[model samples]
Target chain A: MSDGRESFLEVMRSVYERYLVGVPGVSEVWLIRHADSYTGLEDYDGDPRDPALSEKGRAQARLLAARLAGVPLHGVWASGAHRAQQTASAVAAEHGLRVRTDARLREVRTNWDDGRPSELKPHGVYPFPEPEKEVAERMRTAVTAAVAATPPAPDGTTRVAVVGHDSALVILMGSLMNLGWGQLDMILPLTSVSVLAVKDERMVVRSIGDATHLAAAPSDVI
Target chain B: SDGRESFLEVMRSVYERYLVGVPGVSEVWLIRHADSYTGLEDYDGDPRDPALSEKGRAQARLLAARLAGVPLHGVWASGAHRAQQTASAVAAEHGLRVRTDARLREVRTNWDDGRPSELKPHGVYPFPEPEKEVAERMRTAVTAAVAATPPAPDGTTRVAVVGHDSALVILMGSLMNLGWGQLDMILPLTSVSVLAVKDERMVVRSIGDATHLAAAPSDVI
Candidate 1:
């Protein structure tokens, strides 16, 4: 794990030195999707509410953690779900930090009892059984607090990572950018990282669902 | 080259398969022009029509290589030399000529101490064109370009437009109906924002993706 951390930091430092240093903005919030989990959606037997990471999910989490280890992370956060916390634990450990668990960042409420073969929306399984308005309000509150908790970084960027589910994060992204619900159709891969740059009350999305880091993993890992 | 192509294909497929997967939906690529020589110490060119800096050229060449695999049908650029030059790289790869539009140009602003007046902090210099007008012009240019292009055999049209930062931000904000603080949206030099349109629906698939620039030469820095 330490070797992985060093290697990741080396690459990040090179990229930062070579590319991002010239670009000036000091505050960013990183939104990450939790890795694969063993929810009962497929088997309809295991716990759907709070499932642990699958074996492959753990690998994806390690890869995601390795990729982000170099960033001078001020704080690491996750939803109250086991999978979200487990995914974030790896990243937090790299910084010798503990995960801040927030129930507000939990996955959207779903009551799917079907066989759950997915297609249209990756999150189309049970649908948003929770009120969409309530979901957005809670998520916005949690995300805003997460962004505010980090002290400013000396090098113009204070970075924080938040791990949440697809639909919830998508809602947050669309809400921040003022996009229509239907317009938010991005298919965020497992462990994908999306970034937002913040200044005062204004927030701008730098990238969304960027999974270039996961490209090295097998395609079937998704 | 083969290895590079395969790598690029894998990367592109991961996104494009789901992005452009809808067989017949058109894709609009909004590309911001590369870094310019406007404020460079050594540059003494026309401030209004400055060409690409040496780094800008490398960024464009790498951008060209990145998009080489895409079957671009039409290419458009603003009248500025930087935008046209950036568009030229991608156009040359597809053997297509760039269609220039003056309306697609950057916000008209007077230069103020090496910085565009509009770029200054609030209460500096109010630009001539209003945000509404700028948005209208950009929206019209993109609408006209899409209307003008012929769809490919797959019933989808893929086109690229190279323009300025503020203009592209205004266009995207207008599309998303972002009323206030639209100016806060940030776009890096040579970044690509993608839009997908099918029937009357439009979705912003991604924004400010400059991952290709990671492979660009670091000499500029």
Candidate 2:
């Protein structure tokens, strides 16, 4: 029972309960979806494998990177996808840390894989079919694994970022909070970020798929 | 045999999961403590009412941000420096005061969870405090919290309670079918648990949920 993961969650729950000091600042674990990937990549490259960020996505990541420049992050984690790397690179580099890729962070593989551009199937529209339970569990396993791997920050003032796929992010958040699927999926935009603050007794949410920072994209870059 | 059947709902409605009817009595937030008192060198928790350190204050600030979005009916806290300190931020945001209760203090007399008057003549006030008593007290506090709240615009009541590890575990254990025993929970510091009263019965949304706090900082003061 003491596999250490529970202890980690417990510690975070307690921290959340006491540190009501107030914010825009606080120790946080942020789950960020990769920026805008070329939604129509299939039209040009016909590839979704390790695809890179779109110009808009690249711009978003840069902006996101800049947005997070001042925040004190101790660890930078990304799923094993090029988009996630690009999305997380700025902050990781800023913190002098390398991106720790967790396999579970990657996109979900369903039997309906047609290899179309991400745009073809907006979020929530699973072009392929997989058990929803499977999707949710994989997402949970991945995020929790990354959470478990994080190095400690200095105190309640420290934080870290986790770059993951939108599908997984939706599933994970919904399932954990007892929220329905439609209430979460597709709703989260590209490069959106959600902040979760885990204290000792309970977990508090600072944000959920917040994309306010995306507003700063150079109109031309998008 | 039932253990074999139940598993993570995961995203049962994945692709289909969305806010259906409306945000009703949403959930209950149970928070413990944030890291505190590190600046005071070797500062023991003897006084238990020490103010928040720089980091603790920062943590409380973030906690305030987390709860700021909701329409909180009220905020309840155990009478302790950290609990009051943590509650004040949210209360300020919600435009209310921290409602303190000695009965909600920590289960042990040696810690901040203890109130001065509750300390028995012996070293320990009361280790387990009789399972029935713990269960009854926890229920009373929760019921009182629910009762204190005015019905939400959505016909739900969203409130928050700040407590300690020992007290919260007892509360959560009562909600679940798991009698007041060992808190077979993973409640980390500053984590949260939620409970929703559906119709007549209470259902658990989640327990020991610290999904929000990104990562743990070093365990300094």
Candidate 3:
């Protein structure tokens, strides 16, 4: 009995010592891709009020909602684009939170001629007129500025989720974590989720393209 | 003195004359407290009397050594005890006298528990008073300071003001005509900051600068 009591006291002392000397846990940020959806035949023009998500899109949102259900969310944010708004709304409704829209997070404006006819599918080739180098540079500037403007979650919150389209979200996530351009394609398919941890004023990618909740369901790649 | 010249025109002429070739002016600097022997929290409740801890004194000494080579012309300090003490340490090193200004006092608050008494190093406080009242007071205070001529002789180039965070924010905002929305640009004054006045216009040259306190003893705070 005496030995057991002594061992318990020793454990308590070790716990207290660790508590005082241990470094605090670093803040975590989760980057979630808006789930499956159809492409808009008309130009989105970066407006959030228009465009209805296809039936598959709703399922993608539900999957994202289920995956994020147990997480402590700081805030739900969406780009000013319609698809992003629809995606964010579905998740926010599930979590009982309001979605805040930021204009800077909108999709990159490309110079694709609306009237031009092409053998290639829409959004098939790189849409911008400039070289990929210039496109990458401009995308970096926009992504950095947008991330800087994003407020960190209040203390103890695990994540702040932003819903955005494939191109814009990829650029932002890539620039934030210092990953090279075009690596965004690795995220694959619509409705995937990426998680980043912010430390020392830089975003570190923890997990990317997580869509395990979607399972093997047939999905639109919009 | 041309009596017919408007105040704006006179100020422009003054700016043209005095601000032409000043040295050591920079775009911006981040300012904060050096590790000090004292905790700012202990001085709360009692508004009038707070002195720097032994660590704070060492921090002051470090700051003095850092400014030893600079051609500082004038030193301004807030009327509060801790700030005045920090300013005096710097002034004493240069054989320069300190000027106490009431405009530099820390923001006035009326809280009960007093756990967080004074301002933190870089925390932001919302302008609590009515917007119009805050704006009007800011304008009046800045105008008075700008109009007051320095006692130093000709060719004096630099001036340093040690004040509270809110007062410094107000003065900087009023001088730049930045109004309420641009509060992010203001620096927290846990230590010392320098504002450069040239051509009758004030520019934020450096903010929250604690470089002087850097070399001081680590345990000072």
Candidate 4:
């Protein structure tokens, strides 16, 4: 293998080993989900300005916190978007941890006129596929940074939670598994929680699309 | 004055004679209100309509001449028409490529209710209208741009960014990591501003030095 590839693999292996060794009994899970609904009707009021979160969205955020209440969280992060911020803030309040914001963790750019849509319709999402090397590389860089920034658990703790938008979380999961881009659709219910495990720097998929908390009510699926 | 001084002594002598402690640079030529005049509040609330005026062009050209020998490594400009035009002229003159970043755009203001007449005075604005979160984004972008470019690989170098007054000042504050109360010390920027950046820190070496304005007959005040 080329030196670059070898180094990349080596780094991944080392990280996985550290992850596994770091959190022995506790699970090292990274939870990702799409942002809640936005009520503001202002389109292009500001291309990247913060918008308020909807009431339903706030309720959903509370559900997320309650579900992961007992899990030991090493770090909690979210996109700086108003909706994401609200969700992360609610969860952080529940866990008594501060919410760290990352601009890159924001939702993937979608060309929606209203900027609020229930499903990922055509033209609603950008279709840059992975395995198309450049696209995949960019996705990997973003995910790697997010994963690296995750604060390690204190001694026995293993998992962390990242509150982010749908497109970013989906793309991240695919990139980590070497599945390539454009495969996000394979994971249904974009709002569902995804559990990623890290052992010795190698990331293993513990669960994909776990919405047990939201399963209590269909309306909870934002 | 030993003529037989060793290499280390010669180096020290040169350093002492030239007084080159961190280059001792202070003063940044920051661009304030250019000829691309637009009201802060408009019927549509859009802040991106301004373009460089004829006088603005002359002012920019003059700024280029003044900065010709600065050995600038990179040129940055806001995506706005006026800022882009100004930056493009300087970059072309310096033989440098222009990199446009959205974060360098003007401070977002809400004129949805129409321009407030009270905000017309020169340099009376208190704070940028955008949410604190937006300012944070601009800070991240500016830092990223600065880090992405290495200093002139061979010699003393600089980087130029053509941006609006509010955005430029906010970015300058961010680079220095200053608070809002310090805005008074950095506002009322002239048509052309130059900020010196080193080791992730920004120092205003020259602010609003529009020597080019003096040359143009129409550029009064």
Candidate 5:
């Protein structure tokens, strides 16, 4: 069964379990981006912050929910943004916890552009002297609270389900690693899972933009 | 659609998609050598240089199998028997000469030294590196590994480093500002951590990853 499985196809909860165990005080937080949502104005006129999951997003959420159903979660948190809240809905239900919301988890603000979350990219610098720094601060604050307030698992570890936007994930991770924007170098689309593990103040990032669970996932990428 | 296959199917699609076509990331892989035999049984002077046990070989084979497809630019190992043996698996596959450095020895020195070192066996609380001087050895090893590798077209450059747990863990602690004592949690047998560094970013893509090993090998030793 070795030989790298001859031709491997995926990594599931078992592999995730193998990967996450044996580390005491290791807090493994899953930074999950909300699923597919409309980029066009037809749904909500113009605001990018209010879109709920698209029809396909709902499907993706179901898959995501099933994929994470077995995780004995410590807590579930989402940005106040409806898309993120909607994304966390099923998983929270699976864990039997109310989905906790934090405003700081919202999309990072772009100073000179329209307020649309769609037009945003990582700022040239973290704090763009406008809303960028403020946004980064809030995201960092919220993530810190989520990880800190939650109790560790029986294994002396904490596994948290965090649902938020792409930019804020990068910003929060960058803040944790103290690497700034350069820490995040990949594109995270709908339902991508990036993981961070911290043990005794030592942090190891297992992956960023891990979308393995999304593959063969009903072939339903919107 | 129930039981292990359903679980297996879900993981297969996801993990496979992980290594396909993602690029621009540079990785420095930290490998903990597989299980070592207990001094060929019934005889023991010093166990520091023991070779791999039957189980350890199987573990090495699994680690090799898992990492063989990676296009590594450099291969490195501690001169210690176990470390070299483990490094050879991946180094041979990559066709790169294994660069051996004694600097990557076990983090704790002699058990009798009386200080906190990995050699003390059980009940050892958060141990310290033998000395900060020794702690810096991994810094040098990582520097050389990264420097030795040529850049790849995939926007990534990867290197594999094989060594013991104490040294590797202390190195990680030293580098990451995580105190060495944080790990009462020994890494699983034959695990590897993939650390991505470059572009002002230093992040771990995987830690204590034994995904390739048999789910339940043996509890003995």
Candidate 6:
């Protein structure tokens, strides 16, 4: 789907319908990375795979919740991972909504110990349980389902928040934008938010790696 | 690249070389025209080309103030009233003149009946200018701007191009080597989208940044 003149035509059709032709109802997907986790701490003794949130992660989640307080969120969801759920809880609490969990939204599965390295230095060392292609496909399917599971507001905008791990969220974004997995280079910082506006199966990236909310200090002005 | 296989190959090579490395030495700021009186109650001008509304001009001032400190090398805009008006605000901040380019104008619409483009079916009337053609022209103008502006002592040449939402999107989306279909983003009025280039490689730094609007006065009329 990412090749040749056919794909170009496919892309043009979408741009025409979404932008030139116009469509009714937009679904705003807020892609968020989970807050800091205890896995980063050298002294942590809990299960490396599911370490809980650290103190700083808690603070970050609190701030993230405050940042999204004004948004009329339709659904707040997270991966089955502990940190993802914990981070999402803060925002879900604000809306009197429980955090919905989907295991497929969890980070890329790998078989190893110690801290998770972002990229494999060389292939065949600490191999991933699931291939990158599989992860990419599942992330797309899972996120799409998550969006479809929710209904739109009266104003024709359905806003859903998905909190997940860094690489997982990055893969989801790349897939949504139809970028090749090899071309993916975005590193979503902890608790950062990226927004995508989707209409009639066409997804447009409104913003990526937006951390201004986290960067701003309550006392300071921009 | 997605359109032509070879173009994608060239784009990949360039992206890998520059993205993996680059102390960005130049920047192109793409600005969208502010709230125009196209559909506003106060606007009674030519339907085909609407000028910036009162709030739109105010939005331009706020956008200008936001970018006032940047050491801009040049400012350019479409010959259209709204875009030229928006560019003037930013150009005035740096004591520069607003360079006009007809190629940077918004996508041509159905002016046969003077009805807005939205009311007419796309295929029935068809846009006078295709998105691909618009994107190509935009790329030409931007490439010229980059080649014309030499880097400053600090090794950075910043240029601002004020254009319409759809045209700017086409330009940036094409520069990203993306297929026209997935370039599905809307740029807010008077928003700033930055594209940074280094060693002849480019990447979008930000898109539709409207933080400056938060500081502007409310548009409650």
- Per-residue CA lDDT of model 3 for A75-165, tens digit only, reads 6777766667888887777667788876655555543222222222122245434344444355445434444555564444235677765
Interface RMSD, in order shown? 16.9, 15.0, 25.4, 33.8, 17.2, 14.6
A1-222 per-residue lDDT for model 6 (tens digits): 221333323443464455422355667788888887642344445655577887667777888888777666889889988889998999888877778998889887643322333333231232355666688778777778888887676544568899887766666677666654434344455777777777766666666654444433231110
Candidate 1's residue-wise lDDT over B113-179, tens digit each?
2332223342232456677899889888887888888987544467899998767877776676654
* Candidate 5 lDDT, A186-205, residue by residue in tens: 33656767666665544455
Superposition-based RMSD of candidate 6 using all C-alpha atoms, in angstroms:
9.9
Task: List per-prediction Cα lDDT, in the order shown.
Answer: 0.69, 0.59, 0.48, 0.51, 0.61, 0.67
Query: For candidate 5 chain B, which ten residues in a row score worst on lDDT?
Result: B1-10
TM-score of each: 0.60, 0.48, 0.40, 0.38, 0.50, 0.60
Task: Give per-candidate clash totals.
Answer: 2, 73, 13, 32, 14, 2
Which tens-of-lDDT digit does each residue in B1-221 have in candidate 4? 21212322432343233222245332223455354542322313233355666656666676676566455667777787777787787778778888888877666643322332222222344333643555576666656666666755544444666767656656554543444433223222234544444554454432333333332343322
Candidate 4 vs candidate 5, DockQ winner:
5
DockQ for every model comes to: 0.07, 0.04, 0.01, 0.01, 0.03, 0.11
- List the candidates ranked by lDDT, beginning with the highest: 1, 6, 5, 2, 4, 3
Predicted candidate 5 versus true structure: per-residue lDDT over B1-221, tens digit per residue: 11323323432343223332234556778888887743344324344466877777888887887677666778788887788888998788878788887777776543324432223332343334454765677777677677777896544577888987667766655554554443223455677766666544454444455535423343321
Best DockQ among the predictions, by candidate number: 6
Scored against the true structure, residue A157 in model 6 reaches a CA lDDT of: 51
In model 6, pairs of residues that clash are A11-B181, B1-B8
The TM-score each candidate achieves on chain A is 0.77, 0.74, 0.65, 0.67, 0.74, 0.78
Per residue, candidate 3 scores C-alpha lDDT tens digits across B1-221 of 32212322432343233232344332111122222213434434342345766665677676666555544555666566667777777678778787766655545432322222332222234334444455455434433444453533423344545555455555555544444433333232244444445444555422333323222333541
lDDT of 4: 0.51
Evaluate candidate 3 and give its CAPRI docking class based on DockQ: incorrect
Error in Å for residue A83 of model 5: 7.9
Candidate 6: residue B145 lDDT (0-100): 77
- A44 Cα displacement, candidate 6 (Å): 5.6
Model 1, residue A72: distance off in Å is: 13
Recovered fraction of real interface contacts per model:
0.12, 0.00, 0.00, 0.00, 0.01, 0.11
